[PDB]
Amino acid sequence: DNGKRRDVICETEFIYPFGNETADKEIEITIHLKADRQVGYLYTEIPTLKYNKDWLFLMTQDDCMHSAFSYTWAAIHGKPLSYIYYCDLAHLQNGDLPPDYYSLGKTLATTNGTGQEVRFSFGTTVAADDDLMNTQTWVQNGYTRDYFRFYKKTMLVWGNLQEMMNYGVSIAFHDLNLPDEDKTEDKLLAQFPVAQSMIREKLNNRTCKMLAEPNGDKNYIKAALRYDKIRTLCAQSGATKLYPFQENGDIEQVVIERAFYDPPEGSGLTNPDMIKAAILKEMENPKEERAAISIGAHNTDTGWVNFLEWLNDTYGRDGDDSMWFTNQEEYYEYYYYRLHSKPEIKQVNTHTWKLTLNLNGEDSAPFYYPSVTVNIFGLKMGDIESIKSNEDVTGLSYGDHKDFFMLNIDCRKYLAEHAENFVKRYEANPTDVSAKADANYFVNMLKDSDKKTELKKRIE
């Protein structure tokens, strides 16, 4: 019975097994060349930004907001949107949608530079030690007497956040749930692991390794720096301003500057108006002198949805494709690999070269974004007879870029299985056009294989 009220705990049927991700990746890629396209010499690098992007946009949405799901995530991933309401996951799964619902008709993405979509990524803070994350969702298809079930909640329910994990949304600590008098450096230190245990229990044993500083409260940063699982941090003051082409240090336990770009009081401008103006200013500089556009957000709304679309249309897939729009954790990991991994290429015989690269994250937890770009100078797509890879590579996309050759290499261990999970969801919901687009998007991340061919057949 569709029409009957139900109050449910939002749940998703699978979550990427983050706990199982391997820490160490050994990449071996064998490039076989055409007979009359023998090359004398190849050399390699990991470029400054993933996908050979020119500049970096980082986004962390604070306060574990309902709109992180209903507006930010929904707009990026081609999902149903409202102008004034807030869907939970269970609304989308049941098709119980608010009465003003619309959709943009596209996802919001860049490309990877080798012909695939890369949807915008971002981080949300988590109130993991707050029992309000356990709130139920009222689902009731066809009930129009009111829309109270779609009102803004004080924060995300766990199910919303679990689902977002399947799309590579990142996580960060923020406020911890202690009385205000107890928010001393030592007491905050002791509470980090308590929140961490809930994060791990709920998010398939993902370890959170970021703090987004709340309230300008430096006790949080002082405490976080004594908790070794936190590897990266952000704040508005007491931070380093990231210039991605200049930055030379270790950034382990470095507080990276972020800004909210508040509009001047009574000016009728919005935070997105101010961020838009800041981007335009920054883009006038040569890419090497540009700062990262590193934003915080609180509640997101229609204005933010339009802004995200503007980014897709101006600097993403539907514009110049010059931006890397990502979360700080993914960026941190990539910087780490760029600093510490050393790609090599060795000639095996006259027409065969072997590319090798070890990806090893830090000791605390795994890295969850083990994907890199490798550029090969002196090679073109047209020279290549075939490319083969080892088992550690699960996604592989390649092609020409400027006068050289680029490979996008994903080493997420369970990526094929994850892609198959989206295929199964589509198979259980074959009239949902969004479910089909998600299956296609994830299956397209896979390297050429028997499994990829099988999954492609299932989603024709």
The 3 state secondary structure assigned to the chain is CCCCCEEECCCCCCCCCHHHCCCEEEEEEEEEECCCCCCCCCEEECCCCHHHCCEEEEEEECCCCCHHHHHHHHHHCCCCECCCCCCCHHHHHHCCCCCCCECCCCCCEEECCCCCEEECCCEEECCCCCHHHHCCEEECCCCCCCCHHHCCCCCCCHHHHHHHHCCCCEEEECCCCCCHHHCCHHHHHHHHHHHHHHHHHHCCCCCCCEEECCCCCHHHHHHHCCCCCCCEEEECCCCECCCCCCCCCCCCCEEEECECCCCCCCCCCCHHHHHHHHHHHHHCCCHHHCCCEEEEECCCCHHHHHHHHHHHHHCCCCCCCCEEEECHHHHHHHHHHHHHCCCEEEEEECCEEEEEEEEECCCCCCCCCCEEEEEEECCCHHHEEEEEECCCCCEEEEEEECCEEEEEEECCCCHHHHHHHHHHHHHHCCCCHHHHHHHHHHHCCCCCCHHHHHHHHHCC
Give the Å distances, CA to CA, from 294 to 57, 242, 275, 367.
6, 8, 10, 21
Measured in whole angstroms, how far is the alpha carbon of residue 309 from the centre of its chain? 17
Estimate the crossing angle of helix 433-443 against helix 450-458, to 10 degrees: 170
- Residue 379 and residue 108: Cα distance in Å, rounded? 32
According to DSSP, the residues that pair with 449 across neighbouring strands are none
Solved how?
Answer: X-ray
Name all contacts of 280-287 with Cβ < 8 Å and 24+ positions apart.
282/55, 283/55, 287/54, 287/55, 287/245
Resolution (angstroms) stands at: 2.0
Estimate the crossing angle of helix 271-283 against helix 302-314, to 10 degrees: 20
- Residue that has been written with the tokens 């941190």 in this structure: 332
Task: Answer whether 161's CB lies under 8 Å from 202's CB.
Answer: yes
Structural Rg of the chain based on CA atoms: 22
Task: Answer whether 75's CB lies under 8 Å from 309's CB.
Answer: yes
Task: Answer whether 185's CB lies under 8 Å from 219's CB.
Answer: yes
Task: Answer whether 210's CB lies under 8 Å from 329's CB.
Answer: yes
402: left (phi over 0), alpha (psi -120 to 50) or beta: left
- Residue 206 and residue 204: Cα distance in Å, rounded? 6
Which residue type sits at 55? W
Task: Answer whether 176's CB lies under 8 Å from 110's CB.
Answer: no
Residues in the chain: 460
**Domains of the chain: total:** 1
- Residue 430 and residue 428: Cα distance in Å, rounded? 6
According to DSSP, the residues that pair with 404 across neighbouring strands are 401
Give the Å distances, CA to CA, from 373 to 28, 114, 269, 341, 397.
14, 11, 38, 12, 10
Estimate the crossing angle of helix 433-443 against helix 415-428, to 10 degrees: 160
Exposed / middle / buried, residue 32 (Cβ in 10 Å: 0-12, 13-18, 19+): middle
- Residue 389 and residue 384: Cα distance in Å, rounded? 14
Give the chain's end-to-end CA distance (angstroms, integer).
Answer: 32
> Using CA atoms in the order 142, 143, 144, 148, what is the torsion angle rounded to 10 degrees?
-130
Give the Å distances, CA to CA, from 320 to 110, 111, 203, 295, 325.
9, 10, 35, 21, 13
Exposed / middle / buried, residue 250 (Cβ in 10 Å: 0-12, 13-18, 19+): exposed
Single out the residue of 267, 254, 336, 337 nearest to residue 294, CA to CA. 254
Would you tell me how many other CB atoms lie within 10 Å of the CB of residue 291?
Answer: 16
- Residue 51 and residue 115: Cα distance in Å, rounded? 11
- Residue 343 and residue 375: Cα distance in Å, rounded? 10
- Residue 282 and residue 130: Cα distance in Å, rounded? 39
Q: Which domain holds residue 255?
A: 1-460
The sign of the torsion formed by the CA atoms of 231, 370, 248, 240 equals: negative
- Residue 312 and residue 450: Cα distance in Å, rounded? 33
- Residue that has been written with the tokens 């930010």 in this structure: 72
- Residue 429 and residue 66: Cα distance in Å, rounded? 25
According to DSSP, the residues that pair with 398 across neighbouring strands are 407
| Nearby residues of 219 by Cβ (< 8 Å), 6 or more positions away | 183, 184, 185, 188
| Nearby residues of 147 by Cβ (< 8 Å), 6 or more positions away | 85, 98, 99
| Nearby residues of 363 by Cβ (< 8 Å), 6 or more positions away | none
